[PDB]
Design a protein around this nucleic acid. Structure first.
Lengths: 84, 63, 86, 53
RNA sequence: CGGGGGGAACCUGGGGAACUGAAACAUCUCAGUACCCAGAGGAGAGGAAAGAGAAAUCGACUCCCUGAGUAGCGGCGAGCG
RNA sequence: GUGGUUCGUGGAGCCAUGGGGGAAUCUGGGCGGACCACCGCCUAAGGCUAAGUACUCCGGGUGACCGAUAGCGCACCAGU
RNA sequence: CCGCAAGGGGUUGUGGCGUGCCUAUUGAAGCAUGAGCCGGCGACUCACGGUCGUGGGCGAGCUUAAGCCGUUGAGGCGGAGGCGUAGGGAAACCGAGUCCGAACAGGGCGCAAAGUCCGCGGCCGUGGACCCGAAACCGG
RNA sequence: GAGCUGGGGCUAGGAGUGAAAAGCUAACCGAGCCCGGAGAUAGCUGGUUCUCCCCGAAAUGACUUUAGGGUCAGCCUCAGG
RNA sequence: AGGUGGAGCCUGGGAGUGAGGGCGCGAGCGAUAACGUCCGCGUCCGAGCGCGGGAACAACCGAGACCGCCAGCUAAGGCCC
RNA sequence: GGGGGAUGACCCCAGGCGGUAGGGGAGCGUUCCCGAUGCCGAUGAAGGCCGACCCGCGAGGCGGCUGGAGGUAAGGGAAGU
RNA sequence: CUUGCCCGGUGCCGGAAGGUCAAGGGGAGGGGUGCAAGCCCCGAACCGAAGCCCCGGUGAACGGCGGCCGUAACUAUAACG
RNA sequence: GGACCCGGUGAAAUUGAACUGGCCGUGAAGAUGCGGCCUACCCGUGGCAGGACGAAAAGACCCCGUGGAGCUUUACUGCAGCCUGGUGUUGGCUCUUGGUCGCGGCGCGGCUGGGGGCCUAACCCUCGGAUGGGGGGACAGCGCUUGGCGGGCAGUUUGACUGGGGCGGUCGCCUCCUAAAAGGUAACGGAGGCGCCCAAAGGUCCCCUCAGGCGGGACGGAAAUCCGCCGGAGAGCGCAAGGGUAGAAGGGGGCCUGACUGCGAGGCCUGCAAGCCGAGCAGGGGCGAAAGCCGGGCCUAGUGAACCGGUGGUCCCGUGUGGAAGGGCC
């Protein structure tokens, strides 16, 4: 099922509660009205639902799951990378 | 230094955080088997225990 | 390039028939009585047989399964007193 | 399968197009170009079904 | 005017193998290894790109770590990588 | 028809060539992996180039390294 | 004969019960082999991986190569990386959900229990690798 | 006399020579000998060390170019629940 | 139910043998012949299940070897020497 | 294993304890690196030679004779044991 | 002195008209991208080599060189059938 | 002439160790060493061979290691050489027939194929007295690809079982018996079947009552065909057995194909993978008024891993993006 060489693309693993929390420690920076995009644990921002959005925050990242983006609306924003 | 029957690693293989590993049913099909239908409904996945130790291991590391 | 004769010599292979769950134990919607697969189970226990009487299996759930003639297909229900109101 | 030009010959049957097919073993034995029956291709359901192949 | 003869080890080219693993063995492996040959040096090897890859990004060659035992090659087997 | 490359004939390219055909001088001419359009890169088919890595015959330093059947086999009219 | 005296030393006359010692063996005294005698050499090791267990430093844990500092020579800076931080799937991709499918029937998982580096070990792979053992092939 | 011979040389060891048995090739060539692959592989063979504590094995079953090997089970042992 | 008392179950690391025989019994073969072999039920031995007995004799009857030389009852088996 | 252990230890009884492959725990000497606010010896380093105190033990200590110069570590580390 | 009998298979010698068939020429036709000229492949009808198939010749070339029933045979193959 | 007595000199393999007697018994089954017994002082030298399973050598005869090495052929493959098409430095001149498409034909036309000739300037050879002549000559040598023969050689291989190796057999799977009564076990122990098949033995809805024997009549004197009695089904079921079992699986007729996709709670047997069963859930039918049955067969044999590929579907990947070669999924 494998290929005849290389190719490949990209993407990463970044999610809810995850942030809200450890991002609660992210408040040492854009953790106010929160313009996320750490820079501490991962590579290629993605947002996992599970949990309960919060810290009301706009996130400059790739994307996220259903609920998440939803919960998001719970009390925050959602900005996507480059062009979307 | 180490590698792994990368093979089997290819075909049939790949674990869950659970510390367990599985590969696709594997009755007959895909060769000889005019056989039947319902029998068809005979290819999902099969998780063999014990041995799945050589396996996992031998693979170990990346998978 | 063939085979010979006057040597009957012809071992036989394996089977695996049983009564699994025997009579009157914790009944589980699973292989009831066995001695003829493709079998067509029945309802509760069985008592019909080339013998006369019948057999109860003080164990009740969905159903069990037959063996084609032997034993004696089920039908004479018998959930068991252990099937009342909790 | 064990392809044996012995009255033993494997074949299928389309679904008027319902699209694809479904398994079947056969025997010239009788009725040669004979072979019809209905089923249900990914195409809705049912559909006449010739077998010839 | 220069050369050729050396020289433990190391250097590139020229040529170049079975064992053994695959629990046989013809593919494969050991390897481009061991050996032989030529020749440069005190170091040769190589070296400013009809290069790399794709963020319109990078820029000599070399070497150490890393990339990675990954992308991947295959009686998809042992392995090579 | 072989090479090297991770590529063991493969959808299999680049560079290197054993035989045969045998183009172009900047809208030229290879390239980004069959090919094709468009984009993007590069400009061959001559040459020189110290330094950063390797190696111990040599000299020194140092040893949870040895003590005469151990250490190089050979601590001294030994490759005899 | 009593430099550890009313207890022991040495030697044995008798009688009393007794088949040596090693490997491989159903089974061994051996008549199966191993060894004449003494002294010294002489055989489960190291490395990189991985693997469990344990001694312990932080839970996000941890360090390459190198730069500097070095009687003793004193470590200290280096943050590419890599394992954990969801996973599920051939994939697209979705995602605390997901793949089969058009169905709420199951497979994988969610449910944090969280490791990670190191040290020291029983092991597993590559290694000549528990130690010597042959007939042979291949180069000069 | 396809005679015996001294002295001088030529061929060569997967190849020579051979009035030819596989003979002879520096005293055992059914393919020499030394150094090198290399400490080749070697289910077979041996060999396999100081004390002591604790428990206590199998010599069956299933598949093997597998049957005097070894995979998985079955019978051992230690750590926790 | 359980008098018992000390085996049991799961997870996990480390294993060894992967071919045995001997006896009773129930079967197979076999001249119901072999210290023959072949399957079963229990035991037995395992290079120490070392000691007693049957003279001697793993092995069959009794026995479970932590250690105590100048105790005591017995087993099986014996008591004219 | 269990009844209280002060660090020892002491008391009961339960309760065995024969054991090769092989599994777990604990100790011994061997040559070295510490000299974790360590150094003995010309009235002997050490090896040797001989022994009726200390330990289940593998070893210890210690005393007598020998012999010409070393090395010991109360404790942890290492290994060509 | 004398070497007889068989070329169905085999090796060979001759034949080469006919089948076959490699590289290759040589075009129908399809395909991908192409705004389009183009730009790459797959390509097949036929022509096409030895070889092999097929015809013959071949024995101091390999090699091979029948079976049973009856019959004068007072008894036995046999002269015959 | 040694051997023997003297003087002089003065080895050598094997050996655990040993003060090693016979018996008859024994043990692993051919014992000085174990039991009972009988003879039995301590040592030596010249001898004689029997026992110490004496010495020599880790059997050469044997089997076993999916050890090795040499020769063999219609063993496997591959190379050396040899034959061979096209291609090259292998240049000129002429004689010719074939194909083809275009405009059985012929005329022409491009195309291109076969071939015959001295020459001849390569090439080679030739020499013969110098470099010129001579002969051959487009050959060929010789290079590249083709194909072929090809044990001449090179490298591997040529199973297991096996109550000694071989020859002989035999290995999968279905049943009986063996299994001592749960399950299940060797034997080169007994006997016998299978690598099919049936589109209608399929699904249902509707009807049937067997073999046989006896008694009575056409063609009929075994053995039908009908009629009348008797019947724990002994007939019946494509195939071997064994279980089944008429209520029927079993015998007909009616339409019908579920001889289904998506799945399957939950079990049998099980070291592996397999193997096998199955209500019920959904979509969609068929049969019946309907309560229900249908996911092939009365069963248990009719068999195969995973890779190596074909093909009809996908429109998941597509190695600068647009696509396709190619790949993944069915």
């Amino acid at each position: 099922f494998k290929r005849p060489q290389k190719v490949q693309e990209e993407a990463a693993t970044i999610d809810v509660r995850e942030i809200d929390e450890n991002v609660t420690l992210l408040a040492a920076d854009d953790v106010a009205e929160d313009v996320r995009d750490v820079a501490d644990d991962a590579d290629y921002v993605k947002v996992l639902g599970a949990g309960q959005v919060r810290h009301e925050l706009t996130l400059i990242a790739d994307d996220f799951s259903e609920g998440a983006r939803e919960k998001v609306e719970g009390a925050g924003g959602s900005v996507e990378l480059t062009d979307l | 230094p180490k590698m792994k029957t990368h093979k089997m690693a290819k075909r049939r293989i790949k674990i869950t955080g659970t510390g367990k590993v599985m590969a696709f049913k594997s009755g007959k099909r895909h060769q000889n088997t005019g056989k039947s239908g319902d029998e068809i409904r005979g290819k999902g996945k099969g998780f063999v225990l014990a041995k799945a130790e050589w396996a996992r291991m031998k693979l170990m590391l990346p998978r | 390039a063939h085979k010979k004769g006057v040597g009957s010599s012809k071992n036989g292979r394996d089977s695996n028939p049983k009564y699994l769950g025997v009579k009157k134990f914790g009944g589980e919607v699973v292989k009831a009585g066995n001695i003829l697969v493709r079998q067509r189970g029945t309802k509760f226990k069985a008592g019909q047989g080339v013998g006369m009487g019948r057999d109860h299996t003080l164990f009740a759930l969905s159903d069990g399964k037959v063996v084609f003639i032997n034993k004696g297909k089920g039908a004479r229900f018998i959930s068991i007193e252990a099937a009342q109101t909790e | 399968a064990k392809d044996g030009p012995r009255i033993i010959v494997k074949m299928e049957s389309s679904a008027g197009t319902g699209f694809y097919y479904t398994t079947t073993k056969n025997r010239r034995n009788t009725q040669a170009k004979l072979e019809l029956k209905k089923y249900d291709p990914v195409a809705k359901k049912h559909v006449v079904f010739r077998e010839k192949k």
